[PDB]
Amino acid sequence: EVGYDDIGGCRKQMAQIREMVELPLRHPQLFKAIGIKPPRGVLMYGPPGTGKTLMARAVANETGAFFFLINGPEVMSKMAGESESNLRKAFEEAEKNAPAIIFIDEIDSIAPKRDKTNGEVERRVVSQLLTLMDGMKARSNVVVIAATNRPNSIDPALRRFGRFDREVDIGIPDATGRLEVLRIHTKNMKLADDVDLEALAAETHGYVGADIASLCSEAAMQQIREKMLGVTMDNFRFALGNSNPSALRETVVESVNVTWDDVGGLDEIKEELKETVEYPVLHPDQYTKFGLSPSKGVLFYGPPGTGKTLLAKAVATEVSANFISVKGPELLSMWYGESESNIRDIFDKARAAAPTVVFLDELDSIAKARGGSLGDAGGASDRVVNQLLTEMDGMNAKKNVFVIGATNRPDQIDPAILRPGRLDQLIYVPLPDENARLSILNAQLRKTPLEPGLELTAIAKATQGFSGADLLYIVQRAAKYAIKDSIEAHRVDPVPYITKEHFAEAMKTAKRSVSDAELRRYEAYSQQMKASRGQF
Amino acid sequence: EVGYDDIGGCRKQMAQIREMVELPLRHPQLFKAIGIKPPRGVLMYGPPGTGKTLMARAVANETGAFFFLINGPEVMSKMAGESESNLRKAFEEAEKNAPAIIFIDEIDSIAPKRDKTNGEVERRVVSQLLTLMDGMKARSNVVVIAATNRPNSIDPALRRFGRFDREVDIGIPDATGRLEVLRIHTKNMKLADDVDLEALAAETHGYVGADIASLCSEAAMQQIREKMDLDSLGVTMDNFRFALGNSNPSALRETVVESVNVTWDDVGGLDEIKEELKETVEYPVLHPDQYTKFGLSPSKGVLFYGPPGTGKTLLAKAVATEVSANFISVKGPELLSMWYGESESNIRDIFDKARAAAPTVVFLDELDSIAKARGGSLGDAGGASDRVVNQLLTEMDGMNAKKNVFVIGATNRPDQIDPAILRPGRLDQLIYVPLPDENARLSILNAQLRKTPLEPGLELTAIAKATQGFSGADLLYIVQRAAKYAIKDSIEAHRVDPVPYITKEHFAEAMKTAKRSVSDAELRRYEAYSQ
């Protein structure tokens, strides 16, 4: 049976429920001649999966009192009557044998708000539970403990002082809370003493505790399937991949290749991404020492085909934070009334991750600057614009959620979203010229076989004004003709590498996806604020 | 047991329930000598938690008559006849013991509108009470009282002269009306001499009947928590201010704000805007006698229409944790729905809940998505969206009473707001916040950091005279870029400085990447008004 030892992982919300039930029973001498009744009703709320129904089973066997269990739809039945009599027959059973705690579950399902539903019995179950807790000299020896994941769906006359007072929040444990979860579900398992768990507490962030139990259970099935003895870190490293916690189950991002080695030349842009998403996660004490808010997410703009969503994939598989991918205008719906909740529930799950990064590519379909200024198209869809404006900075407190945007031109983007605090980084990625065109050919040919030493400087000399996608199909067409002689291997291809063979017919087709007139729109900004303005 | 001295709050409505259930039974020679027969019991309604079940407890002990308890859904059976047989045998039970009182708790469970329901056996139960309270001859001396919180879902054939005479509305107490509710819920407790209950009544607005009983319950638990380290104690206001943080939201639990606070000193440059915004809230709450002496309604509507970046949406976070009022937050279009009824009823259930917890301040951020009224059907904006505007027009002023609710609006485009809202009575205090000048740029940086070492020997006036035409948000990017390079010079191998001593070398590269957000062409749209 579980107890006060297996309930660990929280201290602030655990001591509130221990002095609410056990302390009036183990020490009743100070609650007399003091004038106040002890609190009698405990209701917890939060995300589903944090163990809101486990804690009632832990305090049942620790106090040593009578315990009752009531399910949600187990009381509801036909032959009108007995949907209220079964609630009456359980409170009178707990009325005797003092003290006696009673656990009612699924208050989100039964007893809803009265004026928001249409149910004939539902007006009677929500009011029979009222008179059973504070009626005419009731609430003598019973203690009602509830567990709900949706507190906004219950009746507003239920969270009052007589019935369910002194509310508690069971949230996601992140400020040194994940480590105590791993020390409970592993003391019964055999573990080889060769690794530490201190660095494993900061690997995942969006875990609810039940997912931490899923991480140790994933490594258990990987251990017995590779030995077909204990457990080792290589089974837990397989549990870190394809993790997918319950808070971010709707969005999957773990489908891309490895990164950090395909990009090249853009060292001042890659290092800017390291100083934004790794600083508040790896060193949180440096920000609290200064007492300042960290820098927010980035925004990418420039020529199409420069490497603006592969760099967003570079922060998808390298950093320890989570990822939520939105494929452009994916969160738009045909209904007028919904039209904001897909923007909300992405950012609602983002603030519950603590921390994570999101990606909103093609911001021209997302920003849509001002519907009053545009009348020639007749859009005026300023509802989804103002919803994104009140979710990144907004009203509530910041919980380290970074937003990454990729577009091509910033003239169709609203200046209200271009301000710092929401999207502060306005970096422009340039075109490679004589410095970044040599390191890209070694980065995109990393896992590829090569011949003895061939110079790649002459490829950069011929290609002038070429984008990053324009440097693709120069070497991709080389691998297209590198398998042409493999078809002629019939009666083994005796060349396991790529020799030249292509630049007499592939380098002569200097294809430019970006025109000269289209490049003039990017080279027009030139931010007018310069350096050398310090004090003297 | 409880009495009439153990029940406070309303007093004019206390006498109308004592002259009806005690006065015909104690003084019976006034009705038969002159006038018609005395009236029957009333139906108590109102918000939940105002002392409407404790009110029926005091008449069950001080009157001394026969009392029988009947709950709403307690009278139920799977049989056909016993759904109403227990109501019939209880009314003749109190008829045998004359006089007697009957309390029907939660009568809305067993008395809805008969024309709305269809195909049940509860329509036999609601028609049983029409012939049991005032039937053929079955009404002599018994009186039946009830306590409910929803009078709208009661049939109109139950509230006539025979059955239920008056609809007593035990509402929210007022100034020097919520002082007596706290004193009698703390009398049996041991207190010290430094407590002052008149100071608590001015800082408890939505605390009506049970939250004021939960404030004394949570502060008593905090005294036990600090005593765990026979013995007498004494409460000394250290835990009343602790329990005042989260004890209000009985009705406003859905719209709780947490936990942003700036403590009225993280904002700078707006010296005249802070004194104008505070005086519209501090005056109608702290001095109610000065407004009823002049006989004029105060100013309530505040609207911010400056450019984005000057500090306008977190300025409502300053009034969220400083003034003594409840805060309701509407984060843009967070309440519209595709059900054709909940698109405008979400406006309705917020404002009367705000009118219940008077006084309070609501916050309507990004009104460009709410006040789109004069364009329709304009291609893609969609029709039938002006009903949320016309509902918003009837809740600012409407046809209601002055309940001292305060509306704060934040928008970045003043030309897209509905001009029907832009009028006094709904939003009268239109204040434009400009970009901070060189005299306000010295008070903008010391309020941002407030906890960092400023390198004593340095001067910050060089940033004030330079970087002209910058908003308040762009100057937060400069102090974050300098802190970005400050921790960059401290993440190396320490085998450098174990001190957060940020110098001018970190601000040298911060001014290079600092850019202007509000353009020169965008600034002329706000200056084109000149009102």
């Binding site: 036909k78 032959m79 009108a80 009557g81 949907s83 249409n118 149910g119 004939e120 019995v121 045909m334 209904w335 007028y336 009334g337 039209s339 007749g378 | 799977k78 049989m79 056909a80 759904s83 049940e120 056996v121 595709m338 059900w339 054709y340 698109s343 291609g379 893609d380 969609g382 029709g383 039938a384 969206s385």
Partner: peptide, 24 residues
């Protein structure tokens, strides 16, 4: 262009509950 402003719920026939008359 045109966005639907309503879902328009028009259904739902609720529960029932029987009245078991005793036999003897």
């Amino acid at each position: 262009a045109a966005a639907a402003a309503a879902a328009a719920a028009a259904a739902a026939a609720a529960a029932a509950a029987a009245a078991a008359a005793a036999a003897a």
